[PDB]
Amino acid sequence: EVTLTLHQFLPAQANVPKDVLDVWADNVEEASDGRIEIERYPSMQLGGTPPELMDQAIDGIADIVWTVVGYTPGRYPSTEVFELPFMVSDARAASYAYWKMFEEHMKDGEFADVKILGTWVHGPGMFHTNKPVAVPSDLEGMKIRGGSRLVNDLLTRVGAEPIGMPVPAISEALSKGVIDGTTIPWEVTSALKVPELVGNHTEFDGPALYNLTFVLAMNKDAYESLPEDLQEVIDSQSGLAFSIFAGGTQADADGPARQIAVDRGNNIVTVSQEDAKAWDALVNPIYETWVAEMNDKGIDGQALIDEAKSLMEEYDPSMDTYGKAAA
Numbered sequence: 001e002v003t004l005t006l007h008q009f010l011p012a013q014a015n016v017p018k019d020v021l022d023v024w025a026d027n028v029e030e031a032s033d034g035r036i037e038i039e040r041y042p043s044m045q046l047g048g049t050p051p052e053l054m055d056q057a058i059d060g061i062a063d064i065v066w067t068v069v070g071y072t073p074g075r076y077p078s079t080e081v082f083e084l085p086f087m088v089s090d091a092r093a094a095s096y097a098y099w100k101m102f103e104e105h106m107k108d109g110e111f112a113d114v115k116i117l118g119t120w121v122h123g124p125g126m127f128h129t130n131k132p133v134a135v136p137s138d139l140e141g142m143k144i145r146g147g148s149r150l151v152n153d154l155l156t157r158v159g160a161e162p163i164g165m166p167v168p169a170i171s172e173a174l175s176k177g178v179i180d181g182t183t184i185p186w187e188v189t190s191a192l193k194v195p196e197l198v199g200n201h202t203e204f205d206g207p208a209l210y211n212l213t214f215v216l217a218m219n220k221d222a223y224e225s226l227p228e229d230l231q232e233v234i235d236s237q238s239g240l241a242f243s244i245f246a247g248g249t250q251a252d253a254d255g256p257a258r259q260i261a262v263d264r265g266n267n268i269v270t271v272s273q274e275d276a277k278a279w280d281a282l283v284n285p286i287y288e289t290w291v292a293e294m295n296d297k298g299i300d301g302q303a304l305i306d307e308a309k310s311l312m313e314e315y316d317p318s319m320d321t322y323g324k325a326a327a
């Protein structure tokens with residue numbers, strides 16, 4: 001008889017909570033034959049700010065959290081291989097690569113203090129602004145919200161003034177004119193009333209401008225102290241197939257979100273793969289600086305980039321098998 005608490009930073013009817021986390025939690029409960037119940041607390045209901053979620057899991061405030069890796073910068077630098085500009089073409093492929101590389105490089109190193117249940121990226125990160133944006137110079141003198149240190153670097157290099165804040169604060173920040181626009185993928189715009197608060201959006205054909213890494217993470221003591229058969233339940237509903245499903249589900253939610261912006265008459269600029277080269281010219285120096293920072297810490301940054309590309313190429317849609325579990 002086991003009760004676990006799950007804490008996260010978006011509303012219960014948001015896309016990841018409802019179609020990813022509730023499916024995972026329901027899977028663990030069904031698979032445990034009712035021996036595990038998971039209480040789900042949305043919108044930081046148990047207190048704190050979203051950046052604090054990783055430490056809430058480590059300190060046992062919550063048993064399980066979904067959080068943005070980038071909200072605790074300087075801690076988990078290996079994840080940042082997926083946050084390099086124009087790196088990712090397919091969120092399922094990247095989430096597959098992210099799980100393999102997590103297990104190879106990160107599990108017993110930068111993530112040793114926590115049990116990692118899932119690793120994924122969102123759909124293409126893109127702009128949502130009070131004024132139309134077609135080329136990098138349009139961002140000059142705009143305050144743009146970012147959620148990671150690599151996204152703040154990207155924003156600086158295209159001539160934006162980056163404002164770092166957790167994603168739920170965007171709505172108030174836009175409404176009060178603290179920011180002129182934000183980075184996010186499409187899927188989460190709906191829950192944040194972004195199409196209501198701004199009339200312009202800039203998306204990119206081909207590779208994503210950026211995407212942020214997430215984890216689903218669990219207090220080590222809470223996991224280790226389960227009986228071994230209940231440990232095997234958590235593991236059976238977690239890891240590689242789960243990670244591909246989390247990234248795929250979240251990426252797929254871009255579509256219905258974009259359609260809301262279209263149907264209201266918001267302006268959407270679609271940057272062609274040709275016109276993206278002007279953007280790439282300003283942001284691709286991050287590859288060289290990031291590799292140098294990793295090399296300074298004795299990490300082969302370029303080998304991490306090469307292995308990410310190789311794993312994303314090796315992903316095949318037949319690996320996307322995650323669904324509702326047997327008991």
Ligand SMILES: O=C(O)CCc1ccccc1
Nearest residue numbers: 122146147166167188212
């Ligand atoms: O950009 C951020 O600060 C976070 C990104 C994010 C996107 C989609 C769901 C939750 C968080």
